[PDB]
Amino acid sequence: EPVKFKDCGSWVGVIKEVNVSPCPTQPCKLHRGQSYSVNVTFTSNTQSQSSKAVVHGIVMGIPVPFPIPESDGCKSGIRCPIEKDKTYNYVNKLPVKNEYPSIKVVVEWELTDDKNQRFFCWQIPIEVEA
Numbered sequence: 001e002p003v004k005f006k007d008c009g010s011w012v013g014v015i016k017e018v019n020v021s022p023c024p025t026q027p028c029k030l031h032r033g034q035s036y037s038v039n040v041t042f043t044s045n046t047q048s049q050s051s052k053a054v055v056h057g058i059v060m061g062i063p064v065p066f067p068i069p070e071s072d073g074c075k076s077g078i079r080c081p082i083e084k085d086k087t088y089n090y091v092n093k094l095p096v097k098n099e100y101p102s103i104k105v106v107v108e109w110e111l112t113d114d115k116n117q118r119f120f121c122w123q124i125p126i127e128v129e130a
């Protein structure tokens with residue numbers, strides 16, 4: 001489902017939609033042991049040979065790197081080279097491990113280009129539980 005998000009600095013890209021599934025109500029509640037589909041539709045404002053995704057889980061106010069299956073954007077539904085003014089659907093999974101504590105977390109997800117400029121940067125509040 002499309003979710004409400006806060007843009008944290010998209011600069012060389014424009015976010016059209018952030019879709020997390022399954023997420024029938026918000027803030028999305030994520031169950032420990034389950035993985036969620038993330039589909040970010042954005043339009044590029046530049047070109048780039050590569051793209052890298054970095055995710056952080058802001059817990060108790062502290063941003064901590066968040067493990068994801070693939071950090072190479074070009075292996076995440078984006079056919080690189082990324083070209084200017086083209087629309088892409090970045091797709092990945094947000095794994096909620098069984099060991100993760102049951103608390104509120106703000107997930108920050110960004111995709112950067114060859115110069116580390118952000119195609120997109122967004123944050124969404126989530127609730128982790130059993």
Ligand SMILES: *[C@@H]1O[C@H](CO)[C@@H](O)[C@H](O)[C@H]1NC(C)=O
Nearest residue numbers: 017019037039040041089091
């Ligand atoms: C991602 O979202 C776009 C736009 O809604 C859709 O066209 C595309 O099929 C989706 N990709 C997935 C979920 O595999």
